[PDB]
Amino acid sequence: RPNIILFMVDDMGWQDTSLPFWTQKTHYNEVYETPNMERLAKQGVMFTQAYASSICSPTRCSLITGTNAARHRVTNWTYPKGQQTDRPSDVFNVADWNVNGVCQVPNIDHTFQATSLAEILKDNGYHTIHCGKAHFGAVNTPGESPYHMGFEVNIAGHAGGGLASYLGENNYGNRTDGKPNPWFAVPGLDKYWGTDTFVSEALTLEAIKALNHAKEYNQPFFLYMAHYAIHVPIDKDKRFYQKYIDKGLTPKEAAYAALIEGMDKSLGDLMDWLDKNGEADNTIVIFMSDNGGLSSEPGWRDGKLHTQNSPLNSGKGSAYEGGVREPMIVRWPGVVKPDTKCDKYLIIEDFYPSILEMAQVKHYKTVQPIDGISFIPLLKQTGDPSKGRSLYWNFPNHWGNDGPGIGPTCTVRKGDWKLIYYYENGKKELFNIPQDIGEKNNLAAQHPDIVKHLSKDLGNYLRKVGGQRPSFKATGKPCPWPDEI
Amino acid sequence: RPNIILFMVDDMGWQDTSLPFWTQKTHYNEVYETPNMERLAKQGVMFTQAYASSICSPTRCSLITGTNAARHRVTNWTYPKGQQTDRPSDVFNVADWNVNGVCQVPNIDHTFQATSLAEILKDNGYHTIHCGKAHFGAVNTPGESPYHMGFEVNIAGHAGGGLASYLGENNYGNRTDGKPNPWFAVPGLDKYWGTDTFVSEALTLEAIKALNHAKEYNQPFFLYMAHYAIHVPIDKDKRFYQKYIDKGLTPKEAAYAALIEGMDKSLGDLMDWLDKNGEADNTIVIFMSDNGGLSSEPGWRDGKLHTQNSPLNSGKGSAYEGGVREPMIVRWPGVVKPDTKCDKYLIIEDFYPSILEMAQVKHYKTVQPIDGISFIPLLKQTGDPSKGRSLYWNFPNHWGNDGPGIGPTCTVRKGDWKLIYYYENGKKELFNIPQDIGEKNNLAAQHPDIVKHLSKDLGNYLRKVGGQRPSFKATGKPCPWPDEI
Ligand SMILES: [Ca+2]
Ligand SMILES: [Ca+2]
């Protein structure tokens, strides 16, 4: 039974790497430096059409419970207990969504009760390690604890979905007065306060400590290496920052490239550990990101706004490909043909049944229905779970910044066609993704047959799984479903 | 569904309290001060005939696994991975016992695999908290972790069964200059280092914050408050030490009395926390100790050696009552009638079914058989699990000291009669416990009928549960079972 490592970067877009996931190298592929992603890819398969939701919380709750985001209703980011983080709107009320996230127990207000992926792995004999960003439940809610969620070891994981600082010189946001700590102060790295250890480095050091400890136990391990990295604020990692200045990047872009290269140093350190300790041929490594790169905030990024995941449109918080299409690599020695690419689409809730299959766990009990479809047939080249398959997103919410494809929406992807419905004004956009990867050309008027059919598909699904919608403040009435206009 | 607090003291004797568990007050009762134990007893039931094993490891593993010590084979104290702590003998070899303790996973070298009591509570909706001495698995084996054993919260719990120092001035044993930490350094209390916080105080304050956090979750809790007190070394607690010196006690005994009182202050502090947060009426409090007081060592205790649990014979490590009869109290408002006593005997593995029944876990499955018998019928005066019941101990090991009843033995108690068999020379002792509480009068010669039947009772049970035995170095052959002599 293999060890499993799920290496999850935060807010990393499809092109925030030197490894080309498109059909040619982009301007971004040329300036970033991720040699360890390339090396991992030479040894495995990369998925060029892998999907998440557009925001941390819906993606990570889908990962750990195996439900679609429309069903678990954690559709915008969580932290404050019993409170909606949504930006105000003069037009609509957001859905009455599950602001407190997921947990494994019943009767926790505004949560989705679910059998945790880590719990099933643990109860089947895996040693389970969480390291970095957890972000599964609101603060003072059982899901705030990686331990409650079935992890036996927890490094730095709590309810926070961001981080107050990468810099050890700032204690990662922790106060040494009687000052109250920020929400996103990173716990569990006290050993490193006041030093110049970047938080990404510290997480990898502690992760390697946990991995050496796991080698004392005669059981396989599951490691969730969930970086805070490349979430805002984009602090400068001085280990690589100047090199990108010398390369001619703006300070903003140099800072961002340097978070990327530091993330990739963490992957290499783990890969080197696997090599030095004889675990590499018996260990599955999965690389993933949880939503698109941030392309709506010019105070962090340069370039034309909403183009920082080029050639994809927009980014984090958007229904467009820039916000949902993610870099994904799997290495499974003996099973997965090295140096290959797979173009069949999949979505984050598939990780749940797939990882359990990799762990050799069958007919397990869950309190919630599982919406993920295993993508082992893509890993083994034996089947195509994307054929005839519909993928669903639902964001009856209001995130923080305006832009293309951002706002309260629900999306269905089926075959070549993507339907994006806009709850606020009833607008519909139809894109043929293989022909129009940048979502430049709205085909809705040229194909009302596809629009009607896809709208029914989307509408039936949302209602079937209990998905929610916003309502209009002027009238009190719910926004029509896609198939009601 | 009530909250449950299991308050477990280490190495506390039947008479290490001001609350008299005998039918007459002793001199120890006069000198010690446990006013909060008296308070708890006036509101609950005292068990005047409650048994553990004579050593920390078999007792604690029986509690957590519901298994009699003979079956789980963690029959002497554990810490070093894969090594016997047993004293060397030029007479016998000890059993090939489970030096590595218990865990919940299989294929772990010298462990008893078992479904943990905290896992079943956790999986049935309880918020599970461990605070203090865990001592469930050897260092660098899975059961060293309270988290592995099903606790969602761990304060100071590791593989250590002892502690380097009670003094925050001594960092509870943790080194700061250079990297060599002693086995029993107390983890998880770094913010108390270099203060004058006695460790029992530190444990209480962190338990109180774990309970405040537990108020945030809409689920009942289980707190395993397992003190390191009153284990050696007997450090002086300045809060109480001089008072006992003024009462007239020798320094050794004043330090012991001070350990006893600081334990009792912790009990009071949790009891007041319950009172002040509205939890006292829906919380079960179980007071228990894991074995008899240390009466082997004149460098720690004054008075006639091997009498420090008087009127009981001997103490820790002995199969005599001084090694196994423990102080036990249960408060359960609305169920248990206050200020009462229960004479019926019970044994530590019974805590496992009883706590699950208190938690209304009406159905569950376990990988291991459950030897404990619920004592809820004693709490409610509905029945008598004690009638006809045999109790069993097996110590096929070599503890560090000699003394009365200490050495490789197995024991059966049944009705009024207790039979101790000595592996080293086949000696048998038969005592009428209700007539001879001090075990001063061996009645084997007077009742050969009994000795044989109880011999067969013991032998059958040991073989039935797969218990173990020493072997002789002369012949190489196992020591005779009691019913082969
Ligand atoms: Ca994210
Ligand atoms: Ca003990």
Largest interface (C-beta under 8 Å): A-B, 22 and 22 residues
Helix proportion range of chain A: 10-25%
| Quaternary | homodimer
The largest sheet of chain A, given as strand count, sense and whether it forms a barrel, is:
9 strands, mixed
Class by helix and strand content of chain A?
alpha/beta
- Strand coverage percent of chain A: 15-25%
SS summary, helix count of chain A: 12
Rg result of chain A = 21 Å
Number of domains in the coordinates of chain A? 1
Order of helices and strands of chain A: EHHEHHEEEHEEHEHHEHEEEHHEEEEHE
Bound molecules: calcium ion
Modified residues (3-oxoalanine (Ser)) (chains A, B): 56
GO molecular function (chains A, B): arylsulfatase activity; metal ion binding
Protein name (chains A, B): Sulfatase
Binding site for Ca(2+) (chains A, B): 10-11, 290
Provide a quick synopsis of the model.
Chains A, B: This is Sulfatase. Two copies of one chain form a homodimer. The first copy, chain A, contains twelve helices and 17 strands.
Q: Which labels suit this protein?
A:
alpha/beta, signal (chains A, B), homodimer, metal ion binding (chains A, B), nine-stranded mixed sheet, 485 residues, binds calcium ion
